[PDB]
Amino acid sequence: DVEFDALLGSYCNTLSLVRFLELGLSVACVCTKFPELAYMNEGRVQFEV
């Protein structure tokens, strides 16, 4: 009589690869980053017509 407790190969590795620029929805954007932003109260944008 032989008794075995076997765990098999954990054949499940879910991968997620994300880049916003590989999405071409960044055509519809102007993405710039402040390296530190949150100190600022109110930024504004001037349009002259």
Binding site: L8, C12, T14, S16
Partner: protein
Amino acid sequence: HQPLIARDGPHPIEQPTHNYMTKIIDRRALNAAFSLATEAIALLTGEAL
């Protein structure tokens, strides 16, 4: 790995869910039958040679 979204609302997501799934496999066993006749035994053995 459950993929996540930072939703625009400041309401808390409260927890992410990342867990392990374990599944018991099953078992089945096959069958066949080969049956030989009476006199075929002695001819393979040599008793009737």
